[PDB]
């Protein structure tokens, strides 16, 4: 939080396994700007997605 | 009594607008600003119904 | 192993601390404008409160 969060820099990596949002539109990710962001960052096995 | 009956009917019709009706939210503007035109169809269909 | 970042976020429960590179505009009053305040897509005449 308390920063500028661009998602066009999130989009240009075309190596994502599953690039899908469940809250909002995935093309509207730069459009809608949030209040707080909670990133649950971890590394697990590829079939548990 | 007739005046209060008319007033209750109008105020219930007003209070129906904030009802979620099973959709994600009640206000159409956030649904337009957060979902695709092939993805907002179901929720806007819920609200219209 | 896959890097998994669960991009979770809370929406419309606080003043906005996370907004990307969306350029602010000039505040115009008393005109039937299609404004965009805090993310919401509102439209109307903006009088000073």
Swiss-Prot record, chain A:
Residues 45-47 are annotated as: Integrin-binding motif. Changing residue 18 to A: In strain: Omicron/BA.2, Omicron/BA.2.12.1, Omicron/BA.4, Omicron/BA.5, Omicron/BQ.1.1, Omicron/XBB.1.5, Omicron/EG.5.1. Changing residue 13 to L: In strain: Omicron/BA.1. Changing residue 15 to P: In strain: Omicron/BA.1, Omicron/BA.2, Omicron/BA.2.12.1, Omicron/BA.2.75, Omicron/BA.4, Omicron/BA.5, Omicron/BQ.1.1, Omicron/XBB.1.5, Omicron/EG.5.1. Changing residue 47 to N: In strain: Omicron/BA.2, Omicron/BA.2.12.1, Omicron/BA.2.75, Omicron/BA.4, Omicron/BA.5, Omicron/BQ.1.1, Omicron/XBB.1.5, Omicron/EG.5.1; complete loss of interaction with host integrins. Binds to host ACE2. RBD also interacts with the N-linked glycan on 'Asn-90' of ACE2. Cleavage of S generates a polybasic C-terminal sequence on S1 that binds to host Neuropilin-1 (NRP1) and Neuropilin-2 (NRP2) receptors. Interacts with host integrin alpha-5/beta-1 (ITGA5:ITGB1) and with ACE2 in complex with integrin alpha-5/beta-1 (ITGA5:ITGB1). May interact via cytoplasmic c-terminus with M protein. May interact (via N-terminus) with host bilirubin and biliverdin, thereby preventing antibody binding to the SARS-CoV-2 spike NTD via an allosteric mechanism. Attaches the virion to the cell membrane by interacting with host receptor, initiating the infection. The major receptor is host ACE2. When S2/S2' has been cleaved, binding to the receptor triggers direct fusion at the cell membrane. When S2/S2' has not been cleaved, binding to the receptor results in internalization of the virus by endocytosis using host TFRC and GRM2 and leading to fusion of the virion membrane with the host endosomal membrane. Alternatively, may use NRP1/NRP2 and integrin as entry receptors. This is Spike protein S1. The lineage of its organism: Viruses, Riboviria, Orthornavirae, Pisuviricota, Pisoniviricetes. The chain holds residues 359 to 407 of 1273 of the full protein.
From Swiss-Prot, chain C:
Residues 13-35 are annotated as: Disordered. Binds to host ACE2. RBD also interacts with the N-linked glycan on 'Asn-90' of ACE2. Cleavage of S generates a polybasic C-terminal sequence on S1 that binds to host Neuropilin-1 (NRP1) and Neuropilin-2 (NRP2) receptors. Interacts with host integrin alpha-5/beta-1 (ITGA5:ITGB1) and with ACE2 in complex with integrin alpha-5/beta-1 (ITGA5:ITGB1). May interact via cytoplasmic c-terminus with M protein. May interact (via N-terminus) with host bilirubin and biliverdin, thereby preventing antibody binding to the SARS-CoV-2 spike NTD via an allosteric mechanism. Attaches the virion to the cell membrane by interacting with host receptor, initiating the infection. The major receptor is host ACE2. When S2/S2' has been cleaved, binding to the receptor triggers direct fusion at the cell membrane. When S2/S2' has not been cleaved, binding to the receptor results in internalization of the virus by endocytosis using host TFRC and GRM2 and leading to fusion of the virion membrane with the host endosomal membrane. Alternatively, may use NRP1/NRP2 and integrin as entry receptors. This is Spike protein S1. It comes from Severe acute respiratory syndrome coronavirus 2 (2019-nCoV). The gene is S. The chain holds residues 507 to 555 of 1273 of the full protein.
């Amino acid at each position: 939080s308390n920063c500028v969060a661009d998602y066009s820099v999130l989009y240009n990596s075309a190596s994502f396994s599953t690039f899908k949002c469940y809250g909002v539109s995935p093309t509207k990710l730069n459009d809608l700007c949030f209040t707080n962001v909670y990133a649950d960052s971890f590394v697990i096995r590829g079939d548990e997605v | 009594d007739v005046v209060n009956q008319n007033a209750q009917a109008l105020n219930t019709l007003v209070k129906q607008l904030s009802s979620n009706f099973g959709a994600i939210s009640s206000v159409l503007n956030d649904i337009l600003s957060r979902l695709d035109p092939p993805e907002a169809e179901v929720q806007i269909d819920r609200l219209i119904t | 192993p896959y890097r998994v970042v669960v991009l979770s976020f809370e929406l419309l429960h606080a003043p906005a601390t996370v907004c990307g590179p969306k350029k602010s505009t000039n505040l115009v009053k008393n005109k039937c404008v299609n404004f965009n305040f805090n993310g919401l897509t509102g439209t109307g005449v903006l009088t000073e409160s």
